[PDB]
Design an enzyme around this catalytic site. Structure first.
Site, short mmCIF file in Angstrom:
data_model
loop_
_atom_site.label_atom_id
_atom_site.label_comp_id
_atom_site.label_asym_id
_atom_site.label_seq_id
_atom_site.Cartn_x
_atom_site.Cartn_y
_atom_site.Cartn_z
N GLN A 4 48.24 7.32 90.40
CA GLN A 4 48.33 8.76 90.26
C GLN A 4 47.15 9.36 89.50
OE1 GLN A 4 52.67 8.35 88.80
NE2 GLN A 4 52.69 10.32 89.88
N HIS B 247 54.43 4.01 94.17
CA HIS B 247 53.10 4.59 94.08
C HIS B 247 52.01 3.53 94.23
CE1 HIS B 247 53.54 8.83 93.12
NE2 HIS B 247 54.38 8.58 92.13
N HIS C 99 60.30 4.05 91.82
CA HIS C 99 59.40 5.18 92.05
C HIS C 99 57.97 4.80 91.71
CE1 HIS C 99 58.66 9.72 91.83
NE2 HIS C 99 57.56 9.20 91.32
N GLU C 100 57.77 4.13 90.58
CA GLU C 100 56.41 3.81 90.13
C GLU C 100 55.80 2.68 90.96
OE1 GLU C 100 55.17 5.92 88.42
OE2 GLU C 100 56.69 6.85 87.13
N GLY D 261 57.29 8.60 83.38
CA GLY D 261 56.57 7.43 83.84
C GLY D 261 55.29 7.87 84.50
N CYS E 233 58.17 14.34 91.01
CA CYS E 233 56.99 13.50 90.91
C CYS E 233 55.83 14.37 90.46
CB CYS E 233 56.66 12.84 92.25
SG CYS E 233 55.23 11.68 92.18
N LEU E 234 55.08 13.90 89.46
CA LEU E 234 53.93 14.68 89.01
C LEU E 234 52.87 14.80 90.10
CD1 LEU E 234 53.61 13.36 85.35
CD2 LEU E 234 54.42 15.59 86.15
#
Ligand SMILES: CCCCC[C@H](CC(=O)NO)C(=O)N[C@H](C(=O)N1CCC[C@H]1CO)C(C)C
Ligand SMILES: [K+]
Ligand SMILES: [Zn+2]
Lengths: 167, 61
Positions: A50, A137, A133-134, A45, A91-92
């Site tokens: 990000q 962000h 999670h997304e 994702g 997480c990236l």
């Protein structure tokens, strides 16, 4: 195109994304770059926050063969259970760290699709984790915010050191 | 490269866990993920490389 992914403790990851008002071809071009960036990382994702684009856009692909790319524009979620489950998340934007986070694993998703049309979905399992999670962000939240103070600070200092070498 | 291999293996196992109906397939997936996490937390690139290769095989099963 491949976009640069911001990394904790960059303060721009704390920006609250603004809603998309029109789903035009410029939005779809951003979505296409977000998918390319996500697939190349690799991750499952990605939120526009990000890639330093502070609009409420999330992409995802939970298929084993990259056959089900999913778009969530102006996403919202609401728990459908008080039960809490643990998932070990990375997480990236927090690269190299994987930690357990407690989240509801049954939620209702409301969003706009890649054409700008509204839809609702009940999500469980990994899809429920990913959408939280997304969405986090897009509200300027990272999974390390759920960790203890000392664990978060060790992660911050380690990444700050890596970044000093990067510059 | 190494990092991409680790990530791709974690993704593969996570999706197998999610889409598996047999709880023994889910257990096997969770076990390989834990070994990856533990090896990567120590920057033990050797064990990570070994576990990735085992993961690819168990997914071919
Ligand atoms: C589970 C919620 C994670 C959401 C997606 C993240 C990418 C990200 O930072 N999104 O904002 C991811 O793909 N993370 C990966 C990750 O942590 N995964 C992928 C499968 C599940 C989990 C490992 O337990 C790593 C390996 C890059
Ligand atoms: K770890
Ligand atoms: Zn993330």
């Amino acid at each position: 195109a491949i976009l640069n992914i911001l990394e904790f403790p960059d303060p721009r990851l704390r920006t609250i994304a603004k809603p998309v008002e029109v789903v035009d071809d410029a939005v779809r071009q951003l979505i296409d770059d977000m998918f390319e960036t996500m697939y190349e990382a690799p991750g499952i994702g990605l939120a526009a926050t990000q890639v330093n684009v502070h609009k409420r856009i999330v992409v995802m692909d939970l298929s084993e063969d990259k056959s089900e790319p999913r778009v969530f524009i102006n996403p919202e979620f609401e728990p459908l259970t008080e039960d809490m489950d643990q998932y070990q998340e990375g997480c990236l934007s927090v690269p190299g760290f994987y930690e357990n986070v407690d989240r509801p694993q049954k939620v209702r998703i409301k969003a706009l699709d890649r054409d700008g049309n509204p839809f609702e979905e009940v999500a469980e399992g990994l899809l429920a984790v990913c959408i939280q999670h997304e969405c986090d962000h897009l509200n300027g939240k990272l999974f390390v915010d759920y960790l203890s103070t000392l664990k978060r600070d060790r992660i911050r200092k380690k990444l700050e050191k890596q970044h000093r070498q990067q510059a | 490269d190494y990092i991409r291999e680790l990530r791709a293996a974690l993704i593969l196992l996570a999706l197998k866990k999610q889409h598996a109906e047999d709880p023994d397939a889910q257990r096997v997936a969770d076990e390989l993920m834990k070994k990856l996490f533990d090896a990567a937390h120590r920057n033990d690139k050797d064990k990570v490389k070994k576990v990735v290769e085992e993961a690819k095989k168990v997914v071919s099963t």
